[PDB]
Design a protein around this ligand. Structure first.
Ligand SMILES: *[C@@H]1O[C@H](CO)[C@@H](O[C@@H]2O[C@H](CO)[C@@H](O[C@@H]3O[C@H](CO[C@H]4O[C@H](CO)[C@@H](O)[C@H](O[C@H]5O[C@H](CO)[C@@H](O)[C@H](O)[C@@H]5O)[C@@H]4O)[C@@H](O)[C@H](O[C@H]4O[C@H](CO)[C@@H](O)[C@H](O)[C@@H]4O[C@H]4O[C@H](CO)[C@@H](O)[C@H](O)[C@@H]4O)[C@@H]3O)[C@H](O)[C@H]2NC(C)=O)[C@H](O)[C@H]1NC(C)=O
Ligand SMILES: *[C@@H]1O[C@H](CO)[C@@H](O[C@@H]2O[C@H](CO)[C@@H](O[C@@H]3O[C@H](CO[C@H]4O[C@H](CO)[C@@H](O)[C@H](O)[C@@H]4O)[C@@H](O)[C@H](O[C@H]4O[C@H](CO)[C@@H](O)[C@H](O)[C@@H]4O)[C@@H]3O)[C@H](O)[C@H]2NC(C)=O)[C@H](O)[C@H]1NC(C)=O
Ligand SMILES: *[C@@H]1O[C@H](CO)[C@@H](O[C@@H]2O[C@H](CO)[C@@H](O[C@@H]3O[C@H](CO)[C@@H](O)[C@H](O)[C@@H]3O)[C@H](O)[C@H]2NC(C)=O)[C@H](O)[C@H]1NC(C)=O
Ligand SMILES: *[C@@H]1O[C@H](CO)[C@@H](O[C@@H]2O[C@H](CO)[C@@H](O)[C@H](O)[C@H]2NC(C)=O)[C@H](O)[C@H]1NC(C)=O
Ligand SMILES: *[C@@H]1O[C@H](CO)[C@@H](O[C@@H]2O[C@H](CO)[C@@H](O)[C@H](O)[C@H]2NC(C)=O)[C@H](O)[C@H]1NC(C)=O
Ligand SMILES: *[C@@H]1O[C@H](CO)[C@@H](O[C@@H]2O[C@H](CO)[C@@H](O)[C@H](O)[C@H]2NC(C)=O)[C@H](O)[C@H]1NC(C)=O
Ligand SMILES: *[C@@H]1O[C@H](CO)[C@@H](O[C@@H]2O[C@H](CO)[C@@H](O)[C@H](O)[C@H]2NC(C)=O)[C@H](O)[C@H]1NC(C)=O
Ligand SMILES: *[C@@H]1O[C@H](CO)[C@@H](O[C@@H]2O[C@H](CO)[C@@H](O)[C@H](O)[C@H]2NC(C)=O)[C@H](O)[C@H]1NC(C)=O
Ligand SMILES: *[C@@H]1O[C@H](CO)[C@@H](O[C@@H]2O[C@H](CO)[C@@H](O)[C@H](O)[C@H]2NC(C)=O)[C@H](O)[C@H]1NC(C)=O
Ligand SMILES: *[C@@H]1O[C@H](CO)[C@@H](O[C@@H]2O[C@H](CO)[C@@H](O)[C@H](O)[C@H]2NC(C)=O)[C@H](O)[C@H]1NC(C)=O
Ligand SMILES: *[C@@H]1O[C@H](CO)[C@@H](O)[C@H](O)[C@H]1NC(C)=O
Ligand SMILES: *[C@@H]1O[C@H](CO)[C@@H](O)[C@H](O)[C@H]1NC(C)=O
Ligand SMILES: [Ca+2]
Ligand SMILES: [Ca+2]
Ligand SMILES: [Ca+2]
Ligand SMILES: [Ca+2]
Ligand SMILES: [Ca+2]
Ligand SMILES: [Ca+2]
Ligand SMILES: [Ca+2]
Ligand code: NA
Lengths: 692, 929
């Protein structure tokens, strides 16, 4: 019956496909003039159309490389694979979509690179001493998580130039500590010391050879060193298939981009490598500090994990900086760097506890929506990341690619990759805009009857004036002609009053606004909805009274964002654990909760009624969390069985409950004892007592 | 939008000298000539033994683009002793800042180093040079005997500079006092009069200067940038400075009183490391004589469409009000890493429209990163956030980014054409370029057709050639033009006329001119500046009845006017420009006589009505409001019939409904024309006789505008007919209503207590919480979810205080969160306890009650009031409760009553509800079975 295909696709085969993915064309002359030329695939068959002469392209997404997921990262046999599939060919027809899927695994026993980038200001003299044996001491703990481990070393202070440096008296240059009654190395921006090696002893050796320097003002130039350690891939020696950890150790605030102007340095950081044979950052005196955006871009590309190991006095600072460079982790460092070891280990586990997907080179007219299956089979819609993972775990993501219109390009390739991973899914997208029958087109006249029009795909379409089925009438004045059924009925007006019916068809009036199309001039290029004075909220194209939303917008008005970042809590939890993110805004579900991310809930039950489930789950193998098999994931706090309860310490919340065995269980929990969270249980629950 | 980009003046300096790092105009009062001033911070000079001392070049504008170095100082380093220099001018970056007020030029060397006279040093105090004709003094406030970093040793004074209106210098020194930064202002008179070449540390009398502060303010870089303007009563320029590292690199902008360096207002950035305060500017952007603040944060990261951070830079625009409060909006860059906001240059009134304009630079934007400069026009409502012109760098890099836009300067009509011009610096390629503003012309066109209604049977005038007569009409078009400033007397316009525009491209040409016999006709035209609305007539006829069939489609007469501006250029080839908000064309339309009665005139009978929707508009939120209209023409045909729905400010037009297949899908549009907001819907052209329409117009009315009765829509149909052209106007009132979903909820923490209490010993005279029992928290929340707000409410808490002389839940202390005060009818915590770090129900009905009453203020949508009641379980009571083992449910209850609303002239209704909160005290040990 009358559909969208038979009212918009009748113009031509290319536009027939352009109408709808469900449309089909007919290239057979046998079909007499009167029946539709663009219709459903079935309807064309039903109208006895030659199956060979039917143009019906189908969108597909076939996998080209489908390597399985590795079980061990130390696999020297086959190349380690942590993402499947690896390559997909996507082919789309106008305004069509095609969904696909990807599996990401946190592979057990993956290789690790650790570059130790160290502040060597005078305050770090004691730190430099405590890490003399750090190497071997580190190699042991890392052995528990990986077999193949390389480490390296690098140091920084600040740009060897005024005002950051002492340049007078002449003795201050050779020894910045001339007045402090001792000696320290002259100022240096960044020097690479030890290229990433598996010879752990080399670390200890090189560290003991190091010595500190001294800066004039408090902020230093670590950002220079961070950049250089990131993009000088060869010098540092990052391995392709290895987790990259860049440990940044400092006890002071830092210079940022544009600070360099005081020094007479106004050339913006190029993000390129500038550490040569001498192993010193040569651009230090001529190039400004890198901006946070630049550092982010390069860290993301080179798959480097920045770890901020800073002292108490500057923690909050670097914490706030970290929130501007996503994926970066911050740890609290002691004044002598005694706890740098556990900091690194704690950071590593944090790093491999999450999987977030990123997209590179995504074509303009192409949109991607995500679903995330992180836990069991629970499908989280509109999410492209998972958290609270353990090494060995595997998450899944469902992806849909939809094209708006049909960009007549050649071939485009984009990348869906998990952040910091080497492996990736490469998508080759191809667009089937026009029909194959258009290649064998005929320029003009000749075959298209006695007229001088044009003929392709078994159909004709004349030029200016000629509106006949096969080049009939001229520039009007050709009598009433056909009069035709230029309307869905006959008692209705002709051509939607937006044109006159000339020669068995409609000729739509012009409009200053935009374009009027359609078989009956019923298509409007500018009558789409409005949200705030703008059409389609200024985030969508108007197509025959319909809004075709832009790559990150949805809804009938094109005013609903697909973003989730504005729904993330301080917990890294979407709308805390209390609601869902609809249009970049948290809609709170948890009874009596509110706030931009549902953070506020003063009438929610005390924390005891939640931690209890973990105690029943972890320590008694029962409860709701057990039944749903979410114990390991949701209950991550350490739960230690204790003899008695204490009164000493701070923040001791006494929680009690009666279990299925009618025994009174008592438990207390610590919070930020040191960023951690403990939970003690009295090992002897109060039970009834027999005779008897 | 009016800046010439075809023929801009291009100036050049020595390569590597950073020619263009600083720019300004030189407008001396001793001459009728004007010049360009360009700083070349790294320029080599003839100063003996000085490498890259830097210089400032004066550039001629009349013809030859020649640049001459100004001779501030030809001497090299002065000596403290033999082979012991007192100063070091090499790499001093002289020219890094340049300012000029009339005959006086101030230039600075922010990297000038100084030995001091106490010890061998090399401290960058910085120095400046003030020149006036031939006299040259050296201003160097930071070069004092307060040395080292804790003092003004590393001040780098002159890093940024500016003059005030009363001839007073403002100077920035980012390095003073451990890089806290410093502002120092001196009278130009004293800077000159007190100069003494034999004194290296001159003290000026009327000096204003910020002073050292606490060490938490260190490394803030006060004086990184400076601008001046008035921000209080007196007409004295106050001091505005950027402090980009302030507040943990959030960045700040300080404003000091121009009279006595007193602090006035502060601004604070919102994203760390964004370098908020890198550039500042002050200019009145909305023509209200109140200077407005512009702040640049070139490394700001906004959130992309994907949701990811992206460095695009941001500019803060703060409109000053007579109140003292600023009205601030924000403005983001367009390219990543382009550093939009690196330079903000006021232009004065670039297009002479009555409001000042401003230029913002993204010196690393554009393809090939050559540099972009965006122009923003001002208006009454503030700054128009959409740039009217982009300026693209024309030079590619060599070893450094061209940095086109890194420095700029405007507000100086250098060719005296009535329009201020603009200098842009590109120090990366040692280039500076001057863009001249083109004169702006405001032209209003006229078009009328006689007669409007064509009668095919009225063959009046003869057709040239044949003996036939035709039904003809007159087409008269008019052009008047005028523009401020310097621009030609006569103007050449290329006007072209088109008959039946909406009916071409293969359709039939339905109306022709008398001679050309075509729908098209062009015409050269030359009008005079002012009010001479020069007009020209044409005679267009109409094809014979048989020639065509269509006679309902109106005949649209189209007129467009071009401009031969390639001819109207000045001597130097500065072509004029049209006002961007003026339409280059205009349309009128004639209609053919059809079904207009015996009198040959169409007299319609238009009438419109709106169905009583009975919908209420609840104050507080956005309300879906769909008005249903019936527009009927119970008379003759109404040409250009339009439905005019004039709507109130509180309303926005969503669109015409289309889901209903029994409702006409009209073609409507929203226009803000004049000071009236209204919706316009096409009802047919012509809306034929007897025609009747039913349409739905969806609206959304955002309210919460306090005391009002209702909102009204006015509807009227109007046509372009001569008789009965409109319909009676119809008003439609929709009542405002009040609705407040107010709820109260509670909770106990814990909600249960198991007996016996561990380690609990009975003390006859209790002192601590530990001595009494466990802590029990009851939290009560009164929250207003509903759209409407309420102004006053009462909260009543009933607390189970005692059961037969036994204390139960002993209240220690209660806290409050929100607009409410509370009062307990009994003394809270009588025993002064402090430290830090079959189940029977005991309600207030069967127990001694402690009442807590609370008065609640205004709770708007989404707001709430919270009562935290912290109590202790009186363990003694439950142990020797005559006997031990028993199960008790301690019940407290809270009710609320909303008593007042702010919407006084509207039907209200008191709101009441309540909840209860229990704490169950039971025995986990059951000695049975
Ligand atoms: C825009 O933002 C900027 C930046 O945030 C604001 O600028 C700041 O404004 C605050 C508020 O005025 C300033 O704080 C004040 O600092 C004064 C500086 O004195 C310094 O030198 C003296 C010696 O001459 C030292 O005594 C001070 O240091 C001592 O104390 C500090 C700790 O505060 C220690 O670390 C030191 O070791 C010293 O012991 C300073 O170095 C300071 O005098 C002033 O103190 C008064 O006010 C505070 C409360 O704010 C009181 O605690 C204090 O006792 C003083 O007030 C009492 O005493 C006076 C008499 O002395 C009485 O008259 C009063 O009635 C009262 O009894 C204060 O701490 C800060 O310096 C300044 N920063 C900068 C860089 O400008 C702008 O305000 C803001 N503008 C707007 C419009 O918002
Ligand atoms: C103003 O006038 C001065 C001269 O008075 C010019 O400065 C000269 O600039 C050139 C380069 O443009 C310098 O030549 C280079 O010298 C380098 C070594 O000297 C530098 O470093 C030492 C360190 O002690 C300093 O003592 C000395 O002052 C310099 O700072 C060499 O490294 C260079 O050779 C190599 O590098 C270059 C670039 O990679 C290669 O092209 C060469 O082939 C070679 O491999 C080079 O010789 C010269 O030293 C500078 N002179 C001075 C006194 O500083 C300014 O350019 C000029 N400015 C303007 C705008 O006119
Ligand atoms: C995008 O734009 C559309 C159109 O304005 C927005 O739709 C509106 O959404 C609001 C949400 O509050 C709807 O209000 C609701 O009305 C119902 C009754 O129908 C009521 O029960 C609810 O309590 C609520 O008040 C409103 O109906 C709707 N407007 C219409 C008529 O389309 C939409 O919110 C925008 N999306 C976003 C999140 O930007
Ligand atoms: C780091 O950023 C946090 C915000 O995430 C800052 O916390 C708030 O800072 C504001 C502005 O100074 C204060 O008004 C609030 O009192 C702070 N709230 C909290 C949670 O403490 C914090 O000050 C920043 N710290 C540093 C050193 O930069
Ligand atoms: C993610 O999950 C949602 C919810 O199941 C999916 O939403 C549906 O998508 C189909 C098309 O694939 C639509 O026909 C339905 O109308 C959608 N339902 C709702 C309620 O939105 C979504 O498709 C999933 N994403 C992917 C890539 O599979
Ligand atoms: C510095 O001068 C300013 C004015 O230039 C003084 O500001 C005055 O403050 C008083 C209150 O003490 C106000 O009532 C006046 O309106 C202000 N004067 C003017 C002219 O507006 C300020 O008091 C001075 N600084 C100090 C420390 O006294
Ligand atoms: C018949 O048509 C003629 C020609 O258009 C009309 O005559 C013109 O009417 C306009 C009215 O604005 C006058 O300005 C012109 O001067 C008239 N032209 C001439 C040649 O006189 C006339 O009005 C029409 N007559 C009737 C009764 O239909
Ligand atoms: C209006 O006058 C202009 C001249 O100002 C005429 O332009 C002529 O057009 C041709 C083709 O561009 C030029 O080569 C001639 O030099 C022009 N002739 C003259 C007289 O200079 C133009 O013909 C006139 N336009 C109309 C429609 O009358
Ligand atoms: C008649 O005037 C209208 C309105 O000024 C013109 O519409 C603009 O045309 C330009 C150039 O084609 C477009 O880029 C704009 O989008 C249009 N503006 C609006 C508001 O739609 C129209 O082009 C003019 N017609 C002719 C033939 O010059
Ligand atoms: C809570 O109590 C305070 C103190 O009485 C009230 O705040 C006062 O409001 C009065 C209005 O007459 C003012 O004159 C006082 O200046 C305010 N007190 C203070 C300390 O400034 C407040 O109105 C009460 N709140 C409610 C909701 O009842
Ligand atoms: C794609 O997603 C759909 C649901 O939208 C699902 O039914 C289907 O199995 C998926 N197809 C593939 C091959 O991933
Ligand atoms: C089109 O082709 C015909 C021959 O069939 C020829 O006579 C005619 O001239 C052509 N049209 C034009 C405009 O020349
Ligand atoms: Ca340090
Ligand atoms: Ca240390
Ligand atoms: Ca003032
Ligand atoms: Ca203003
Ligand atoms: Ca202006
Ligand atoms: Ca000018
Ligand atoms: Ca009549
Ligand atoms: Na009101």
């Amino acid at each position: 019956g009358p559909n969208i295909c038979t009212t918009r696709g009748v113009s031509s085969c290319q536009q027939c496909l352009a109408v709808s993915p469900m449309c089909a064309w007919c290239s057979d002359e046998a079909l007499p003039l009167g029946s539709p030329r663009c219709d459903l695939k079935e309807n064309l068959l039903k109208d006895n159309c030659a199956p060979e002469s039917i143009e019906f392209p189908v969108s597909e997404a076939r996998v080209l490389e489908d390597r399985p997921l590795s079980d061990k990262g130390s696999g020297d046999s086959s190349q380690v694979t942590q993402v499947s599939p690896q390559r997909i060919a996507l082919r789309l027809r106008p305004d069509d979509s095609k969904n696909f899927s990807i599996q990401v695994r946190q592979v057990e026993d993956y290789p690790v690179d650790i570059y130790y980038l160290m502040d060597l200001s005078y305050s770090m003299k004691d730190d430099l001493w405590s890490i003399q044996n750090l190497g071997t001491k580190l190699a042991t703990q890392m052995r528990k998580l990986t077999s193949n481990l390389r480490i390296g070393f690098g140091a920084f202070v600040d740009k060897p130039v005024s005002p950051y440096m002492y340049i007078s008296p002449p003795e201050a240059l050779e020894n910045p500590c001339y007045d402090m009654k001792t000696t320290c190395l002259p100022m240096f921006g960044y020097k690479h010391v030890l290229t990433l090696t598996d010879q752990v002893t080399r670390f200890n050796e090189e560290v003991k050879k190091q010595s500190v320097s001294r800066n004039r003002d408090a902020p230093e130039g670590g950002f220079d060193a961070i950049m250089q350690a990131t993009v000088c891939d060869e010098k540092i020696g990052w391995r392709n298939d290895a987790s990259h950890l860049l440990v940044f150790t400092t006890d002071a605030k830092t210079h940022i981009a544009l600070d360099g102007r005081l020094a007479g340095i106004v050339q913006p950081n190029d993000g390129q490598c500038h550490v040569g044979s001498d192993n010193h950052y040569s651009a230090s005196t001529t190039m400004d500090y890198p901006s946070l955006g630049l550092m982010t871009e390069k860290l993301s590309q080179k798959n480097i994990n920045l770890i901020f190991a800073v002292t108490e006095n500057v923690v909050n600072l670097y914490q706030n900086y970290s929130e501007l460079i996503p994926g970066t982790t911050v740890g609290v460092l002691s004044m002598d760097s005694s706890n740098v070891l556990q900091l690194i280990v704690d950071a590593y586990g944090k790093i491999r506890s999450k999987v977030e997907l990123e997209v590179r080179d995504l074509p303009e007219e192409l949109s991607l929506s995500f679903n995330a299956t992180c836990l069991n089979n629970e499908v989280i819609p509109g999410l492209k990341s998972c958290m609270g993972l353990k090494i060995g775990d595997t998450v899944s993501f469902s992806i849909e690619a939809k094209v708006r219109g049909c960009p007549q390009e050649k071939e485009k390739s984009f990348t869906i990759k998990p952040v910091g991973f080497k492996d990736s899914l490469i998508v080759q997208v191809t667009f089937d805009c026009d029909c194959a029958c258009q290649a064998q087109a005929e320029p003009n006249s000749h075959r298209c009857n006695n007229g001088n029009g044009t003929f392709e795909c078994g159909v004709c379409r004349c030029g200016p004036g000629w509106l006949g089925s096969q080049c009939e009438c001229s520039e009007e004045d050709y009598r009433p002609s056909q009069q035709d059924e230029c309307s869905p009925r006959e008692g209705q007006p002709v051509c939607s009053q937006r044109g006159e019916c000339l020669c068995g068809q409609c000729v739509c009036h012009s409009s200053d606004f935009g374009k009027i199309t359609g078989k009956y001039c019923e298509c409007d290029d500018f009558s789409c909805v409005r949200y705030k004075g703008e059409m389609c909220s200024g985030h969508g194209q108007c197509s025959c009274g319909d809004c075709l939303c832009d790559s990150d917008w949805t809804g009938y008005y094109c005013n609903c964002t697909t973003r989730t970042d504005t729904c993330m809590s301080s917990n890294g939890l979407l709308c805390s654990g209390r609601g869902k993110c609809e249009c970049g805004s948290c809609v709170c579900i948890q009874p009596g909760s509110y706030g931009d991310t549902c953070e506020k809930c003063p009438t929610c039950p005390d924390a005891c009624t939640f931690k209890k489930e973990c105690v029943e789950c972890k320590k008694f193998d029962r409860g709701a969390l057990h039944d749903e098999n979410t114990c390991n994931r949701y209950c991550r706090d350490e739960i230690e069985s204790v003899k008695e309860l204490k009164d000493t310490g701070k923040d001791a919340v006494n929680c009690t409950y009666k279990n299925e065995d009618d025994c009174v269980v008592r438990f207390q929990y610590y919070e930020d004892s040191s960023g951690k969270s403990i939970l003690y249980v009295v090992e002897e629950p109060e039970c009834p007592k027999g005779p008897d | 939008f009016n800046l010439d980009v075809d023929s801009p003046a291009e100036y050049s300096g020595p390569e590597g000298s950073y020619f263009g790092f600083a720019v300004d105009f030189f407008v001396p009062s001793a001459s009728s000539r004007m010049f360009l001033l360009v700083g070349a911070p790294k320029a080599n000079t003839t100063q003996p033994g000085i490498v890259e001392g830097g210089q400032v070049l004066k550039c001629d504008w009349s013809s030859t683009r020649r640049c001459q170095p100004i001779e501030f100082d030809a001497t090299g380093n002065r000596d403290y002793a033999k082979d012991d220099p007192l100063e070091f001018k090499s790499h001093q970056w002289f020219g890094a800042s340049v300012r000029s007020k009339q005959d006086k030029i101030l230039a600075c060397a922010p990297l000038y180093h100084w030995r001091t006279e106490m010890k061998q040093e090399r401290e960058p105090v910085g120095t400046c040079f003030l020149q006036d004709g031939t006299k040259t003094v050296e201003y160097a406030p930071c070069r004092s005997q307060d040395i080292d970093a804790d003092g003004q040793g590393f001040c780098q004074g002159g890093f940024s500079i500016d003059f005030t209106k009363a001839d007073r210098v403002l100077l920035g020194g980012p390095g003073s006092f451990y890089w806290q930064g410093q502002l120092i202002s001196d009278q130009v008179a004293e800077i000159v009069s007190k100069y003494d070449p034999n004194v290296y540390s001159i003290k000026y009398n009327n000096q204003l200067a910020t002073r050292t502060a606490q060490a938490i303010f260190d490394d803030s870089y006060l004086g990184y940038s400076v601008a001046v303007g008035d921000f209080n009563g007196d007409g004295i320029d106050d001091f505005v400075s950027g402090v980009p590292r302030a507040a943990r690199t959030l960045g700040m902008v300080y404003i000091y009183d121009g009279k006595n360096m007193s602090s006035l207002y502060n601004f604070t950035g919102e994203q760390m490391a964004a370098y908020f305060g890198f550039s500042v500017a002050a200019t009145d952007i909305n023509g209200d004589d109140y200077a407005d603040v512009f702040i640049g944060a070139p490394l700001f990261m906004d959130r992309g469409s994907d949701g990811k951070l992206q460095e695009v830079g941001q500019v803060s625009v703060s409109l000053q009000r007579a109140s003292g409060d600023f009205q601030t909006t924000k403005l983001n860059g367009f390219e990543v890493f382009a550093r939009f906001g690196s330079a903000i240059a006021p232009l004065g009134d670039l297009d002479q429209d009555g409001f000042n304009d401003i230029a913002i630079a993204a010196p690393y934007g554009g393809e090939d990163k050559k540099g972009i400069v965006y122009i923003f026009n001002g208006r009454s409502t503030g700054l128009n956030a959409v740039p009217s012109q982009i300026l693209e760098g024309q030079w590619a890099a060599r070893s450094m980014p061209p940095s086109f836009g890194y420095s700029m300067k405007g507000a100086t009509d250098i060719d005296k054409n009535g329009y201020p011009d603009l200098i842009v610096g590109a120090f990366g390629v040692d280039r500076a370029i001057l863009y001249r503003a083109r004169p702006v012309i405001t032209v209003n066109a006229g078009l009328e057709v006689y007669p409007s209604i064509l009668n095919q049977d009225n063959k009046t005038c003869s057709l040239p050639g044949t003996a036939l007569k035709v039904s003809c009409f007159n087409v008269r078009f008019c052009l008047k033009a005028d523009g401020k400033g310097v621009l030609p007397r006569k103007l050449n316009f290329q006007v072209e006329l088109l008959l039946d525009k909406l009916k071409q491209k293969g359709a039939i040409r339905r109306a022709l001119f008398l001679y050309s016999r075509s729908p098209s006709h062009s015409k050269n035209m030359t009008i005079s500046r002012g009010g001479l609305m020069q007009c020209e007539e044409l005679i267009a006829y109409l094809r014979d009845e048989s020639e065509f069939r269509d006679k309902l489609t109106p005949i649209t007469i189209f007129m467009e006017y071009r401009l031969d501006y390639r001819t109207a250029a000045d001597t130097t080839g500065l072509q004029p420009i049209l006002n961007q908000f003026t339409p280059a064309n205009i349309s009128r339309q004639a209609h053919i006589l059809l079904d207009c009665g015996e009198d040959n005139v169409c007299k319609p009978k238009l009438e419109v009505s709106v169905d009583s929707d009975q919908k209420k508009i609840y104050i507080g939120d956005d309300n879906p409001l769909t008005l249903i209209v019936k527009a009927q023409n119970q008379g003759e045909g109404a040409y250009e019939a339009e439905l005019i729905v004039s709507i109130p400010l509180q309303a926005d037009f969503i669109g015409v409904v289309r889901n209903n297949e029994a409702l006409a899908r009209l073609s409507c549009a929203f226009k803000t024309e004049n000071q009236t907001r209204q919706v316009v819907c096409d009802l047919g052209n012509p809306m034929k006789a007897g025609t009747q329409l039913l349409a739905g117009l969806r609206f959304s009315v955002h309210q919460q505008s306090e005391m009002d009765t209702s909102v009204k829509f006015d509807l009227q149909i109007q046509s372009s007919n001569l008789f009965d052209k409109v319909s009676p106007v119809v008003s439609h009132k929709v009542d405002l209503a009040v609705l407040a979903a107010v709820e109260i909820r509670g909770v106990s923490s814990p909600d249960h207590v198991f007996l016996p209490i561990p380690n609990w010993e009975h003390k006859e005279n209790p002192e601590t919480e530990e001595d009494v029992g466990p802590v029990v928290q009851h939290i009560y929340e009164l929250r207003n979810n509903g759209p409407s707000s309420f102004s006053k409410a009462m909260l009543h808490l009933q607390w189970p205080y005692k059961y037969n002389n036994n204390t139960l839940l002993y209240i220690l202390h209660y806290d409050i969160d929100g607009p409410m005060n509370c009062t307990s009818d009994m003394e809270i915590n009588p025993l002064r306890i402090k430290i830090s770090s079959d189940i029977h129900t005991l309600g207030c009905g069967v127990a001694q009650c402690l009442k807590i009453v609370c008065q609640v203020g205004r709770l708007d949508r989404g707001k709430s009031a919270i009562l935290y009641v912290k109590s202790l379980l009186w363990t003694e009571t439950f142990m020797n409760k005559e006997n031990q083992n028993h199960s008790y449910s301690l019940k407290s209850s809270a009710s609320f009553n909303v008593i007042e609303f702010p919407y006084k002239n509207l039907p209200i209704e008191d709101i009441t509800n309540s909840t209860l909160v229990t704490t169950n005290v039971t025995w986990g040990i059951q000695p049975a079975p």
